[model samples]
Target: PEFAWEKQQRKTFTAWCNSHLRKAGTQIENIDEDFRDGLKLMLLLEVISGERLPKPERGKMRVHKINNVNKALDFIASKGVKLVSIGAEEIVDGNAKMTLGMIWTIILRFAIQDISVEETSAKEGLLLWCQRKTAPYKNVNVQNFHISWKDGLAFNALIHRHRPELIEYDKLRKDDPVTNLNNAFEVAEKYLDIPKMLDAEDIVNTARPDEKAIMTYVSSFYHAFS
Candidate 1:
């Protein structure tokens, strides 16, 4: 009989998930049910929003960075981990063009996270940092392409469906800004009930659409002449 591909794919994915959870020093049984539900909800929102979501902001700062990413990759690779490249794209502006490593570096980062990749706030912070460090002159253009997490999950599911023994469901969920902020306040207040962390003034104080890091990154990738 021909092998059932779907079953095998699910099994393989589950196995990978289990390994990832183990590596993170966490267990499925230990996860808070509410947190897990919130994570699923956040992922669904990310999928539905696609690339239209705005980035998250923290007071006057943005979290996540390319340097941090570079460090992570370096650390992983140092441990003799083998990485596979999955995708790439090029952004051109005037006399300069840069091929953004879309597949292995960018997409894989989020794919491995197995969480809401649509959280622009977090991703943008890192991108902004990369832009500042890499492109500081002339018009810069960035070409970015990402694999949809939903699509990736579906593909993984299809590929490992029959491999039940290889399946593991231990993927850790990424932090959701709204949820985390709320949680942070709850912790501070020592109760589940907590007030909103920011008001209009607070937001205004933190908002910086023209942040140097963001602009730098945008200009570098998109080839902006300034």
Candidate 2:
């Protein structure tokens, strides 16, 4: 069955990807064609699933002390989330500089507690969907998302890190983007079997539960304390 939101989702996802890639100083052509296609496919799957990965939670306690604020910011950076602002003035004025502390608070409040079976199933379903839908352009669209072979390999390496069980080391070393993209579907299929994965439970099992977390994570800016 045709997904009602597919067209809109495709447009939005493509735009998101383009913006991110541009920010990273990488052109779409720098990535492998198959890898690009696979990324798009994954985006499509996420869209079809109709679930947005929730942001992490934020804590209420403010660090008014400069040292405490610095420590918090450091902690956030350690977690790998980027805090950025657009304009030079914003960066200089601290309005643009995203602090590690700010991010940690966000994660603690917003990130999902559990990976639902429905979400996993949606990912699997999307893989199957791509296997059927993209089969036609499998070969012809090979160069659509051109990237240097090395860059393609690097991208796949990252994927392997996340789904080591699904990707064989030898294949990653040898396969180009086309083969890698095809293999990603298999990996996604495997991922579906995981009823839940990662530290999702910790988020879900909070004592105060959704109260502080939702307010801190979702509605933070509205009530943000200076």
Candidate 3:
């Protein structure tokens, strides 16, 4: 027997999603498969992170995003059914289809939700995606985005710590991804380095491995936010 509140939440989430989908002109007839992806991620981010991850592109860019307040309410009221029928990995995957901008937005969501982005394959994907967005080593001045003051101060530190070749974009552009990633593997045959692990390898060997890596990182990052 489901609890009364649980049942109510099912109704609420359905209604909320329907209303928004309708209002956003994202109804089943009008929408794509990924229509509810954002909201579902919002729930997962909360259920998984226990915090409200920041929007990756505030003031806006075409990027990813994260959670909002009252996750329990939102989950039950907006995305309850989808989550129940679908699995957590699907939520991560659905969001994975979003563009670079969208990816950043969700990354911040994870961060905001306080998900620990460890030295995981997902983090590597995150780095790779960012690199891919601004690849070919022009080092375009598109670094106009903002982050929290704390992140701001430690960003350089983090970059230094991670030492992603593409972070500051001084690395030589690769002729091919496979060869490029081979360089990423500091140790031959085995992934000994933390930062330059599969993330680098996945970028090339696995077309858009960043998506799965990011998903994997995020999926594996949190034990479960509920």
Candidate 4:
């Protein structure tokens, strides 16, 4: 159970990291292997937190790796996340469990918890808002932030629910997740002026998309439309 859970989290976290890091032209594949140097980890924090860190040390030496990871930890601490037992040495040593724990911490603070939709906040409020908004859409059912959104219909439904003229909900194909996802993203970016924060493949292509990351994006809809 432990090994399987970690593997699943690795993929989900990788996708979540890539969703943010892609804007900077980077990606993460191995949670354990990727952050050993802390280069990408800092970038992930920078992107998610909307802050920049000092230029990373160029050396790949153990000392340099620890320095970079410490830099990331310092930045996270400065944001007041109160990182627990995970530390620079543990991340530089590629402790998979600690690494995953570290990323999850940042996700909670910067992504999941940092949301507001009127009086509602956090993950549950965001989900409630989504359910309420998309309730009338025939093919859309937003149960949770994972597979319920994989078909991409829910996103289109949200947009259509708020601004019906922008999309033809009846014309969309729920079975074609990629096209549906792309259509909603491009339309939302172009017309609604919402930033394209996610990739289609990240949602439908992965076995389980990261809930926090998806919620962060979905929260954008509530802010814009509400």
Best by lDDT: 4
Writing each residue's lDDT as its tens digit, candidate 4 over 1-226 gives: 5653355456656766777788788987677898899899889988877789978996968999999999998998888878878889989999988888888787667766756666777787788888888998878888899889999899899898888998888878878999898889888889976667576776776787767557656766765775
lDDT of 4 at 20: 78
Best of the candidates, TM-score: 4
lDDT of 2 by residue, 89-173 (tens): 2222343112212322333322322212334422233223223333343232212111221122422333354445655746543
Runs off by more than 4 Å, candidate 4: 1-8, 138-156, 159-226
RMSD of 3: 17.7
Q: Which ten residues in a row have the lowest lDDT in candidate 1?
A: 87-96
lDDT of 3 by residue, 138-221 (tens): 423223221110111212222322345423333424344454334433322223212221333324343223332333222221
Better of 2 and 3 by TM-score: 3
lDDT of each: 0.27, 0.30, 0.32, 0.80
What TM-score goes with each of the models?
0.18, 0.22, 0.25, 0.67
Name the candidate, 3 or 4, with the larger lDDT value.
4
Query: 71 in model 3: Cα distance from truth in Å?
Result: 15
Give me the runs in candidate 1 sitting further than 4 Å from their true place. 1-7, 19-69, 81-226
Candidate 4 — what's its lDDT?
0.80
lDDT (10s digit) by residue, model 1, range 107-129: 23433222222353334544443
Q: Rank the candidates by lDDT, best first.
A: 4, 3, 2, 1
